[PDB]
């Protein structure tokens, strides 16, 4: 249609950065499945590069606002108030992802940052 670049189910599947979601639950309220932290964070970096800089940061948005599928099903939008972790904490840790605080690995901008650029300078 317009800006539909980057394939979804292939390269950028539905429910992206799932290990990052549970990683917020543990790093914030010490809650989450029984695993290690450096291991979860490592999984986020594998999903960070697997997701090419093209449409990269977009997925994070798909998690907050949620995405729709061609079949008519919805996914993501799981960022909710967990027992001891309100949407507020997930929103504070949410950013600083593509920056040197999570899995930056450089973006399309060839620098530590994405979106929120000059403000629609196209």
34 catalytic per annotation: yes
> Dihedrals φ, ψ of 77, to 5°?
55, 20
85: β partners: 82
CA distance 96 to 18: 16
Please identify which of the residues 21, 27, 34, 43 carries the catalytic annotation: 34
Q: What is the DSSP letter of 75?
A: E
CA-based nearest residue to 111, from 27, 48, 53: 53
- By annotation, the residues acting in catalysis are 34
């Amino acid at each position: 249609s317009v800006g539909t670049s980057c394939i979804p189910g292939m390269a950028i599947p539905h429910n992206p950065l799932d290990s990052c979601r549970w990683y917020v639950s543990t790093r914030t309220c010490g809650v989450g499945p029984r695993l290690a932290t450096q291991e979860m964070k490592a999984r986020c970096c594998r999903q960070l590069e697997a997701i090419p800089a093209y449409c990269r940061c977009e997925a994070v948005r798909i998690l907050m606002d949620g995405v729709v599928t061609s079949s008519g099903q919805h996914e993501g939008r799981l960022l909710q108030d967990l027992p001891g972790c309100p949407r507020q904490v997930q929103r504070a840790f949410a950013p600083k992802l593509v920056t040197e605080v999570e899995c930056n690995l450089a973006t399309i901008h060839g620098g530590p940052f994405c979106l929120s650029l000059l403000g629609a300078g196209e």
